[PDB]
Design a protein around this ligand. Sequence first.
Ligand code: NA
Ligand code: NA
Lengths: 66, 66
Amino acid sequence: MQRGKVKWFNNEKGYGFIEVEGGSDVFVHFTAIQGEGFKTLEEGQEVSFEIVQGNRGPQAANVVKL
Amino acid sequence: MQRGKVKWFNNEKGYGFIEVEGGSDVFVHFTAIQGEGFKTLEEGQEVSFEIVQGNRGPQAANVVKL
Ligand code: NA
Ligand code: NA
């Protein structure tokens, strides 16, 4: 588990990337976003998350807005 | 998606396992469950999901109640 900030998120498409200090960007799909409310992220938002490997490569899991 | 059936799920602990045909049971955490509902599953529940590899091995992502 670790923290990062949303790099960008296309609200219409429901995905974007988390930027990591000193690391590679991490793909994030809306289905990973925790909490209640419309599943979205905004550029700059700090998040905690886990990295998992799926068929398309690394992606975020358990994305909590801080 | 992959299909399976919930073997058990403990809604106090927030986890359980999904049984899948021809393979090992897959760990499922409440944070993977989709829907604005309460994030719980019940024994026997048919689901669609994705298997991803996390730091503890295979686990469920994107768990949708069918
Ligand atoms: Na970076
Ligand atoms: Na099995």
